[model samples]
Target: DYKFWYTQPVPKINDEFNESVNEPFISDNKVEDVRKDEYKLPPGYSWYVCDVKDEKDRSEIYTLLTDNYVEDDDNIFRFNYSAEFLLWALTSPNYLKTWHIGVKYDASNKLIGFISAIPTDICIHKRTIKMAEVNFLCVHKTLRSKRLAPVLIKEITRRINLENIWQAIYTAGVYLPKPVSDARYYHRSINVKKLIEIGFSSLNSRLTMSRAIKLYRVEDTLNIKNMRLMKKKDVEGVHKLLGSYLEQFNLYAVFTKEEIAHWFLPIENVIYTYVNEENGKIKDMISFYSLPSQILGNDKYSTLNAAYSFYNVTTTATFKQLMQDAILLAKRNNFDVFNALEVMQNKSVFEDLKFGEGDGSLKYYLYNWKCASFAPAHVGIVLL
Candidate 1:
């Protein structure tokens, strides 16, 4: 799903940021945009933009987001709407920082629509500048008929391009049966033992792993033979290793060095292992934590219990190792089930580990499309 072909382009340079900057460009009447971080709203509709800048406003909007956004029963990447889960996206490295931007609208004193975006620094050789990943698009139930989505997208892309940013990637498919960009890889893995107990006939395993692979990428291969658990002294190396890995996926959370420390070696409930040992010269890494497995429903025939797998990070080489370690550790833990979330399809890895597919499918979407690439990325192999 990665073809670094569109990083730089003779982008459709519409000088729309300066004129009609904050105002919506409607079907009629033209206004010059004076793009600024803050702006006055048009007479009838009011807009309060939040982009990790205005602290008070951004925080307040999250409340509105929590209140308004709905999890499309059919959507796989529905994490943005669930209040508890939105917490992760809200605090995510990009969402909590300036690299990402979000804007909300309230018309006639009612919340109308929302759009979100994150800035990615796509690198080529030594050149690297800002690029955007736009998703989190939603329109209030009442306003869906007004056709507000296209105009907002036009406005947002105009604002981004005006800044002369390199490019953007839109993960949504605009409701196409098959996306303009093919699904390079779809993520999935199974808890074989669980599948046997719960009939797989009723479940569509594809969606189960979709949520985890949204807006994904694997920039460079992290091939390696050397690996080990991370130590206090390995924090710096670990950070650098994961940084490049994250960049490949167009993710640069404000995950500080302190955070990197906790991730490599958790204090309380979680544990991590790093792989960096080869030819006496070490390279490559991956990490994962174990959480209490729980089952839904009561303790009857419907009762269930299981552990969850999370906090996976991996380099090219460490990916194969990741599968090896997870399977080995899971068996040692006496776990009957192991899960890998919305992930790219990698038969070699999971099948090799004797893991099969699970139940459910994930539905992914994006808000703005014009400036974004529809390309997809492959699955993670350390569950890579």
Candidate 2:
């Protein structure tokens, strides 16, 4: 079914790996020898290099996504990513704005298609590779028939290759070629009544509203003692903790202090992070980001505020106890749901904390790289 994916430097659906699958599928790509021209679009479209930090360009990207981004199968919910979140997601240490690619309609100069790539160094087992984490691939609904997504992907790949980078990682709702890992979503309902009202969730067959409410009630405060908001001073300690902890996994991100500060330092309404310290050493850390969804055709509710689990490391408290604190913190902040994927030690805590399993599975893919597949629990990286 994925005719387009078959042409790329990715593993075939039936390909299996043994011990010798640590290098690129196409290692012959050289920067000075690669194509310099951009991918050709339709007759009326032209390429636009988006400066994601610029207010105008950020709004343009936001607008394009709000109208055309991922939607639920029922078409009743759509992701609404704020401009601030976009800036935080796109700009990291040594980030290049030129990789933020867009397609513009020639007549009105309207932004119609978009994709972005950010640099990352990830550890695949014992091998660490420099790769681009590709995300935010979108095409305007009116232009879906034009097949503009491939051009967007190819152009981004060219831009990344210009920097002498050849490997990439991305995730999609639908399976493509071969996935290096697979994960299922688990959700905890904070605002149970409203969820039922908006059709976001339903009452179990034998449970009454009062019983469901009591079943999901949570505490109002984080329980981990000495746990406080992560400060700038804790970046180094957090970095050390994260680096040592991530190495235990089969696949995980290798983050530097600069990357840790950029991702974990709290941004009001954008991200929240907490760390427990005693004697200048972080014992545990937990973080989550805010992303709301627009509820379609609902008069009682317009949005569902969501908090997604980002990264966590537990040393003093058990993993289960730390997760309960995260849920409590989210509830105190008025979030309607706390969402987590069954990756990286999350499965150990989800059932104990009463998180219901979701049906959808997120497939993690690597471009131009191949390795043996992993169990969901062995995967450590989480995409935005």
Candidate 3:
């Protein structure tokens, strides 16, 4: 891994960048060098940044998410993050506050490619570490032959590492080529019979699962958790809970302790919360990061901000309890939404608890499929 850093920040993509190391986005668009606070996508085109720290930018980000992914009965794709979760991911402590870059090219711009990454604190089997998640590597379907995804991804990694981030994780979409050639990966499809039993989908793959998993709502009670933001003190117990979930699903990117605390804490987002504590013990732990609520504009509530779920580990008397906490937290902050990642396989108490499908679906594909299931995988972002 270090070798990649020393030899080349990212693997080479195609040459559309105009040069090996001197394109506008690569060299001229250095993080500190942007003329505006953010980069400009072409006209009639748009872009998104995953770890957006500013609350004022929420609506734009939300629109981007909605425009890109489909919604379905599977919670995974049915929803995008509530304003609450986006805030936490950007300002969380367990992360270096890395941001995934996004772009929507205009037809005039030729609509070539896009990339995204998020500040991530990977909680491996027993340890946690800081990293970034590189995601949403999409290019116009017609432009794929140019291998534009690799360029955008490699550039994002270079940009992130320049900011002190060392690694990133993400699962590849079935339509996209593989991200890694040397990692073992696996995933569970939504139970078709169960969905049929629940009347969500006739065929399992029929759902598109794209939205963020929000805190489970009480009135909508089911087998799911009442999730909420996590607190510092809950780390120990949450670790235990997450570990239990991992016992069933056997895959994850490597992580360390320092990174977990650095990337997931909400205090940095300015609207931090883990509001509910049970018996003085933090159960079903989760956390968010954000800017002040006042920075939030619009009666529409979350239009002005973004929030991301940093760390959530459910293990309360009822999983429903945890989801309740998440909703309570979002409502308290006047946040309109909370978000989770795409098709995650492990440590997903939300999906486990809220067996009620979110009406969505996604799949991963690999170009170089190798490694044991024990090897690090990008199936879901370190957080995806």
Candidate 3, lDDT over the whole model: 0.42
Candidate 1, run of 10 with poorest lDDT: 19-28
The top-ranked prediction according to TM-score is: 2
Q: Give TM per candidate.
A: 0.49, 0.98, 0.44
Ranking by TM-score: 2, 1, 3
Global lDDT of each model?
0.41, 0.89, 0.42
User: Considering summed lDDT, which 10 consecutive residues are worst modelled in model 2?
Assistant: 219-228
TM-score of 1: 0.49
Give per-residue lDDT, candidate 2, residue 141. Answer: 89
Give the per-residue lDDT of model 3 (tens digit) for 33-132: 4223344333565544444665555444544444443233332232344454555444444444345555556555322354556564544332344556
Rank candidates, lDDT, best first: 2, 3, 1
Residue-level lDDT tens digits of model 2 in 20-136: 678789887888987988888879889999999899999999999988998877789889988999999999998998989899999999999999999999888689999999999
Runs in model 1 lying further than 4 Å from the true structure:
1-44, 51-111, 124-129, 173-181, 184-235, 242-284, 287-318, 324-347, 353-384
RMSD of each: 11.1, 1.1, 11.9
lDDT comparison, 2 vs 3, better candidate: 2
For residues 112-161, write the lDDT of model 1, one tens digit per residue.
Answer: 56666555443321224355566556666556646466545555655665
Ranked by TM-score, the better of candidates 2 and 3 is 2
Give the clashing residue pairs of candidate 2, or none: none
